[PDB]
């Protein structure tokens, strides 16, 4: 319960994320169950990599976060300088500032 309280939003999305994480460990027969999720978390613990993979799983499981972000991202481009420091993106054009 304590564990859930601190890091875990404990929704459907969170559960999904957790599942994904466990799969990425390796787990075959649907790894391990969740009474309150706590057990699952405990099981994961040995694998040790928890909250990063929800900061990916919400970007995929829908892209609503992505949409929000859009409403950007800069690479080490040609002639950065590196005094120049801006790069947006939008689908009709790769708008660089």
């Amino acid at each position: 319960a304590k564990s859930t309280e601190n890091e875990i939003p404990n929704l459907i999305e969170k559960m999904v994320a957790k599942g994904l994480n466990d799969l990425v460990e390796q787990y075959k027969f649907r790894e391990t169950t969740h009474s309150k999720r706590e057990l699952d978390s405990g099981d994961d613990q040995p694998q040790s990599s928890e909250a990063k993979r929800t900061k990916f799983s919400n970007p995929a499981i829908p892209p609503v976060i992505d949409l929000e972000k859009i409403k950007k991202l800069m690479t080490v481009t040609k002639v950065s300088l590196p005094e120049g420091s801006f790069k947006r993106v939008k689908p009709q054009y790769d708008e660089i500032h």
């Binding site: 790894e31 169950t33 057990l39 099981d43 970007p59 995929a60 892209p63 689908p91």
Partner: protein
Amino acid sequence: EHPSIRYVAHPLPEKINEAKVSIKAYLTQHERKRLRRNRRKMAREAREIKIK
């Protein structure tokens, strides 16, 4: 008198520490398919968005 013949004992039953093996809950074929369908679908959607 030193060991009494009156009383009936009910001593402490020592509970052995059982190792909680969290059960491999399995999935139905259908369930598995659904899982695969949905994750893949989500990925596809992401790709589309992150390309449209």
